[PDB]
Model the fold of this input.
Amino acid sequence: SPSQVRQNYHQDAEAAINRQINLELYASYVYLSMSCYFDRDDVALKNFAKYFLHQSHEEREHAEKLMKLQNQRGGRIFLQDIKKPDRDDWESGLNAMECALHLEKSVNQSLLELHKLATDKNDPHLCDFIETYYLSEQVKSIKELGDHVTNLRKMGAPEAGMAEYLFDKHTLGH
Amino acid sequence: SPSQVRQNYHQDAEAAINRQINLELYASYVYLSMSCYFDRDDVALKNFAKYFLHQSHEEREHAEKLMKLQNQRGGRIFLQDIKKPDRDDWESGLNAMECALHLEKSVNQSLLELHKLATDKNDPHLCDFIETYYLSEQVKSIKELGDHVTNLRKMGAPEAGMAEYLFDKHTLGH
Amino acid sequence: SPSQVRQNYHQDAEAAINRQINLELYASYVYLSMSCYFDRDDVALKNFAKYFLHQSHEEREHAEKLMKLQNQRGGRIFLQDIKKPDRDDWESGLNAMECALHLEKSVNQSLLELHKLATDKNDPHLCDFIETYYLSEQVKSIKELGDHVTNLRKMGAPEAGMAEYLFDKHTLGH
Amino acid sequence: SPSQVRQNYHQDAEAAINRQINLELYASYVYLSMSCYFDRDDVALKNFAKYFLHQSHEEREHAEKLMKLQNQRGGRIFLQDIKKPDRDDWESGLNAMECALHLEKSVNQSLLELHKLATDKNDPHLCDFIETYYLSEQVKSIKELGDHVTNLRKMGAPEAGMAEYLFDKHTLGH
Amino acid sequence: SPSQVRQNYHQDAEAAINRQINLELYASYVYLSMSCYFDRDDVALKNFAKYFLHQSHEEREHAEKLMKLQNQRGGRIFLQDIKKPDRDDWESGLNAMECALHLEKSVNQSLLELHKLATDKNDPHLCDFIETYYLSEQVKSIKELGDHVTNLRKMGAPEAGMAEYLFDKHTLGH
Amino acid sequence: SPSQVRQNYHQDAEAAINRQINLELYASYVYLSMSCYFDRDDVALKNFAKYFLHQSHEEREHAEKLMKLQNQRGGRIFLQDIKKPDRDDWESGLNAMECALHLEKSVNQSLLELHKLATDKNDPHLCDFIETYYLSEQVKSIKELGDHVTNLRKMGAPEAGMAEYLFDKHTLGH
Ligand SMILES: [Fe+3]
Ligand SMILES: [Fe+3]
Done:
């Protein structure tokens, strides 16, 4: 008994969207963990905390958009446990940005695998949806984090103690 | 003697666009028939009539956009008879929404076949055009009609006489 | 079992309105064909295309108003195939205007026959409706097209190559 | 080595806040599941979906405020897996509201246990924080859901098919 | 040692972008040459000069966007000599428009080859980027130039001495 | 057969303007190369990239003004290959500013040679044109770059890793 709206939507695509939803929610939770770390008294980097909180909310919005897609196409959302982040302590501004870069590239890889699946199942609506709302956004986010990692490294973070402070004010404070 | 503008535009694609134009015009005419039915004195559901008239005008706009595409790419528009709708009497609000759902899925299937052809002929401009302006719009329309059918069925239409009346006011009147 | 609203509405009038609806929809489709022709790359007369697209939408509005009339008076709308226009290629600006003039006079003749029928069946509401919304509009459209044909002919269209270009800009561009 | 800011903040309170954070995030995820269910084509109750999405975002805000508290008082946030909701299918508007009521009372009970702990450890700042931002908000939410359950039951939900439809429009649409 | 941001970006794609950059810069330089020609005292067609100067600046913007893409994806921009246009004297308004049409179709062909390469290397971000910002823009530009060539030819350019003058004022002056 | 407008315009001056046009276009291309380098992920200095992109567009404007001059005076523009910049990698903020300083002084020297030629051929309009729009602009640009080089050197660039970062924000970000 398929959904009345369902058309040219393979079960593999439905399953892969459900996995992507979980990954985006996981990414949101990792960013929330990072945001919390920079709000600690012994870290105290507000704009780092604000940056990662913004990323957290963006990743949640990405998850909710996939949920909308799933229902649009007549698929059924099956939620799974959102696993806790790998770390509680993210060590430094630089380390968190490096971990964020690793995370975004892992999310991007999953989306490329999802696109590949959509192309293989001749699902052009899903292909377009991924292209329009996800792939371009990932490339921009990966580039931005790459830029942030570069600058922090050059400034001498984390050993140079004014590096992450001034980066917080100049880059992330504007 | 090809058009001066023509480039990477297969004759099969040109022919398939001409068929799509006819189908969109047909869809416009079906919706106009529905709109007329709900303006009858013995049916008298104004917001149903307004809904389907809006759909009629949207389907015409879709046809005219395909005509623009055809001329853009150097193809030549060949018009065919717009066949009369299958029915004059659409029975009920629910039945019309169900018939509209069937129609939109038939239009969507044709667009997916058109996309498939464009992919096979390595015509990425045409692929993108279909993706951007048609596929996303169909999925939204199919979902919307699916929602409308669900609600009307649940409310008890058409046997429950206040179902289509209140649906006209609450869903289609806002 | 006549409609509850039906009064002094002969079956011949009902049938003749249904024929007029089809003719107005046909006229809309002819004008759309013309509009498409002037959007071709090898014709490229934008204001000609805009003019005939406007006429197309006006003829559709005329058809929808007749549909409203039919339902107002308790008649039942029976739709027929909208036949394809006689031509795909309309040759020139002048030729299209001449064909448009022929079309409008054919539509006007049908309306005069419809009025005659309404007078014969002592249907003054229908008479007035045709007089108010159709006959005056046709006479104006016929005169306008007559004017356009005259000017284009005088300017030397279609052989004089700047005739239709400058007519597009001066008459139809304002 | 306690935090420099830490004062009159027991380790049991720190641990209990971390548990409350997880519960609020869980509650957010349950509400997101509900919101998704009412966006299904075969359920199609938009204002139910909007209601529960709002609740989801509120519960997340509650979690983030506890995280702020934890860092304010010098405690350390330890995140745990956000467990998947008990259900994917929430059956009906009424059932979801009943499940939401059960959830909010479970969250409220945890907060009362958290307050009890704060009182036992003579932590008046934490007591006040829970009183100010949580207890009053829970009582209001529990009352609101109680009201919603009552109305839906009285209207005849879920068997009366117009009950949840009209409740969606009148109560949740305003 | 690949770029930190680089992901699913083939070396062939990187090389092909660098070639496209050069071609867009070349196209900018051809249009600048045309613009200069119509600013000559013995040609003196200001709106032709303004038209081609606008095209020149658009082609430069296209080149700079490809440069942004290259850096976004972690590729490295390698610039080459921007070759001088084939001509200094562009003869006439019509001839320049015909040469512009030839140029745009050559640029479009290169972009289609670039898309083909991106599809072959399963690079959907690059595919989408080309589709979104380039292919649609080329088709529009090719159509526009096709229209301009048609009108000028019909008006009798370049032999009819008022053709290019009036085309400058009516088409390119508005 | 000289141009109808040509008066007191030596062929040597005409030739020297054509060379200056090429040099200004070359300078534009060098600055574009620099701008691209600072948009790299492993360099990531946005205001450096914006600075040099602004310089690129200014040098193009200078070239187009010389083209206008050439046509004003009845000379004929003969375009040559715009040679690729000497480097792809500009190493550092400081190095690029030093290379920019060298470039501007080379452009200025060419303009002084062009002025000398104009004085020798008793061409006061050309002398004034160079004086008004070029010489004053070069001196200002050379001074500005001199200032930038000084500050960066003093701050400890490129070895001091916060030098180019903070210079990007304070000097080039305002
Ligand atoms: Fe009501
Ligand atoms: Fe500073």
Summary: Chain D touches chain A at residues 3-5, 29, 32-33, 36-37, 39-42, 53, 60, 64, 67-68, 70-71, 74, 76-85, 88 (CB under 8 Å).
